[PDB]
Amino acid sequence: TLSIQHGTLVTMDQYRRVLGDSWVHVQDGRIVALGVHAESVPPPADRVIDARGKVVLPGFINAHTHVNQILLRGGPSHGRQFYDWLFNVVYPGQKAMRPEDVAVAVRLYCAEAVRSGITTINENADSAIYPGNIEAAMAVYGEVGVRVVYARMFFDRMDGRIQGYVDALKARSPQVELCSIMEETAVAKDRITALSDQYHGTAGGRISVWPAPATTTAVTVEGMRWAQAFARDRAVMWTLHMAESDHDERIHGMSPAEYMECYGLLDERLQVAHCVYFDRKDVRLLHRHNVKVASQVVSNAYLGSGVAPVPEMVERGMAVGIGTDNGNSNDSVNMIGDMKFMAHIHRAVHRDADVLTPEKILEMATIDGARSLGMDHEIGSIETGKRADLILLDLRHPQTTPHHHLAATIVFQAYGNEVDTVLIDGNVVMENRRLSFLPPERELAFLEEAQSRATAILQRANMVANPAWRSL
Amino acid sequence: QTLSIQHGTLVTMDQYRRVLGDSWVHVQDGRIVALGVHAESVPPPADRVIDARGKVVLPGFINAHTHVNQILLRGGPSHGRQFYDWLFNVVYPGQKAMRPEDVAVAVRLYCAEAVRSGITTINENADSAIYPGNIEAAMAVYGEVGVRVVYARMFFDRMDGRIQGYVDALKARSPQVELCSIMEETAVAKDRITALSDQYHGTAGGRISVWPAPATTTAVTVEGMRWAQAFARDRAVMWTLHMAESDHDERIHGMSPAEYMECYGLLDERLQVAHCVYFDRKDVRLLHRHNVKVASQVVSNAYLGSGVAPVPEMVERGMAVGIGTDNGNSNDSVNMIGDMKFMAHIHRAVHRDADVLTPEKILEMATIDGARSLGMDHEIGSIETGKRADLILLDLRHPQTTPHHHLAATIVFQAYGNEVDTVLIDGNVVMENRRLSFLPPERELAFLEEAQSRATAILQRANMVANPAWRSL
Amino acid sequence: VGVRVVYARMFFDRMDGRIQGYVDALKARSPQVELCSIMEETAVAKDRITALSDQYHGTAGGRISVWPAPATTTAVTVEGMRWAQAFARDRAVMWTLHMAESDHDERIHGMSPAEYMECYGLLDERLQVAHCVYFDRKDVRLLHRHNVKVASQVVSNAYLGSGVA
Ligand SMILES: [Fe+3]
Ligand SMILES: [Fe+3]
């Protein structure tokens, strides 16, 4: 049992209560009780965590990300439109990674993520097809203690239209191999079903498995319908990348949202990612079927895609979470940095300093994010009965001083290093910035290994790591 | 007295943009005296050696336009408001309620944040210099801290009567907060600024400079702007003005502020303009023609709902565009690395062009081009012989900055702003292993509590709401 | 007749001087038709509307109701709008105003009428606004936030060449 005491609790509960000098009691992975110190004595606990002078929040929820690609950041990944990045960087880089590289990628990602207060990660696994990768990744997620949705991507249909464009893009890095990860529909089903049977609900309920048809052009109608029915039969969600680029825009003369509507493929268990190339009608169609959304505001900028209509969706009460997207289209895994970006980009583009409140941005990173993953009954707020995914932030630093309104301070001032202590499913995963799965005496050597492995991955893939200085 | 920084990777920002692995820098009497590569040359003897092994050495970051004292108004009171709403309901009244002893604490807090993020030069646009005691309080702290400072003394000498019914409506949003005026007579502004320059310009070993700062083209007379212009020329400094930050500035007398200034011969190579959001192609051509310097406040232009300035166009014309963090309470951080990432992304998003500004270019804007925007590029902004020793040491051995191959990309797209370890300004160690010379670790927490209290009290005296009720929509 | 009727009594208590040279030009289209004024002093509008409400509100078997109706945000003072707002609250009715029907209404003092009303706390759940043609995304958000009611005059917005809300 664990008692967190004397903090300010930012509950994100139904009344958005903010409780000064208050406590939380945790038992068997759950929040069992809460109270105010002046009115009540906290129950006895095996241990007390002192949060005096600190702010307690629900853990941040990364609503859509791609983990293993983190080893491709730091030089190779920037300055390219989506498809250029995909074909010259992501596909070949992923392919050159071995299972032992994956294990290091995952631990590096989880170290950055937990340090920034992320406790749930929706991993869209585009490299699950390669032998050994699932097993390597899953062993590290389990050990680390993070809550993970492992959304297994598949592609079962050739999009032949885009080929002369692809060859031109490939000529930018001709020594880098063009890859294919297409699989037959029935093979994808069997592989995802077996993955779910083996890993879903493992690591004490912390790991889930979803089917992830990649896009409306890369997956057949049958494949998407299978994913849809699978989500329904197993009480999970299914997810798809929607309208991330201007070449996706026209699946057969209508938008991807329209196309899915025609086939009855929009439902309340679908979470779509991106939605940059969206019009009013598309928003209406998602709204009507209660589709969940993950917005990758930073990555949409990094890749030169654009700006999604998040304010419109939010004003319709839609469940919109925030994803950091790829470890190499951001290039950080920092929810607080992404929140600030979500606040500012929309203000700038609408010329409206009040287009999204910092409270609302904080909601997107917590309780609404949970809702976007279909997990809001279990996580995303500090409420009795929910899982004990909790973070303690210290605002006593120069950047976060002064602080009066907590959501404003967090969104507009915090850098992302203010998170001290992190609980996931009631287990202490970080304490005073010390990571339980990467102790301080191993941290530097681990980073050097990740650095070396990245350098080697890029050599095997024939990718340029450090292009010559260019001002224009 | 001498200092040797050894075994770092030097990101010089010099004329060839040299990046020198396992290299050294020798510092003497506030100046970079020599550099070299360890494998080809032995460093000169020095009184002390700073070991930068495994670290990256950069020129110090340059904050090309900011407002310091306002930092005590962040944390609740300042967000969610268009420029004029923010100005009249927050900034003016908040500043007015601050006493000199509050100003001293504001300045130290700002400098602590700034130095911790690698900022070594600050262009402080002082909008509260009119209040007795404020200059002296601020200057003593800047001096003690060791930071390089341009103190640009803002003035307003003309009523802009057009915007009054708009102002009253805006004031009704916070009716208990007092409307207040900082207008002065032209001649009084001139005398005050001249005296401030005579007393403080070149002080603190040359670290402190004084510029005149006519506020805007509507708040200052032609005569006031011409005086500022001539003053800059006679004293070999710059003058600065806020340009086209909002859609209500846009029309000084039926043309843009740039056109208006052109008409009166007020665009010249010693002018540094701030903002330039409401700018068209012609305005950019006019600034370009006269070699006007520009400070872009990309983050604040978003925060205040103003928009996005045409930075790519200016940069492609070779113009000197620096990056400013702007107000301590329209950002609301003082973090150059965070703002660089925002500069990189906002423009990519708006142009739908992932390559619209390279991370190298963004790093140039924060260093050598920033120096150029202040007219100080002969003295600072690059690691070159003869220039001042304003240098920062970054450690990239953290999760977020791993892996790292291309340094500018890593810094711009991965660094959070806490990776700066050690900071030199004018050759003096102002920060070492994150320990601040002017705010030692055993005083830090108590100082932050005092800033917090003083802020709470400032807001009470001004009748400003600190912590508005939770609002989702 | 037996119809259910809300009688929203319009008033105007403030001169909008800005639009006068425009008005004279318009008047020259029919110069023999006289230019009229229906302005009243604030206190007179209040007394008249109060007396009308006391006399007719709830009559004809509850079929007739009386609301105050400040005409627009440029033709009524802040004090007049606030009185209407409080009157609606005290008597459990609504108040109503014409909003942003034309491109010359658009700028009450350098912001939209919705913004102007928000500044003074004049958007609430008992307000019903009419028209909303010259409205942007921010205006819609402001109304939504305060649960303002809306009447849309789609045919008339066409007939008069205003546009489409
Ligand atoms: Fe994605
Ligand atoms: Fe400014």
Author numbering:
A (entry chain B): 3 to 474
B (entry chain A): 2 to 474
C (entry chain E): 146 to 310
Q: What do the paper's sentences say?
A:
Atrazine chlorohydrolase (AtzA) was discovered and purified in the early 1990s from soil that had been exposed to the widely used herbicide atrazine. It was subsequently found that this enzyme catalyzes the first and necessary step in the breakdown of atrazine by the soil organism Pseudomonas sp. strain ADP. While AtzA is a hexamer that contains one essential Fe2+ per monomer, TrzN (which is ∼25% identical to AtzA) is a dimer that has a single Zn2+ bound in each active site. Although it has taken 20 years, a crystal structure of the full hexameric form of AtzA has now been obtained.
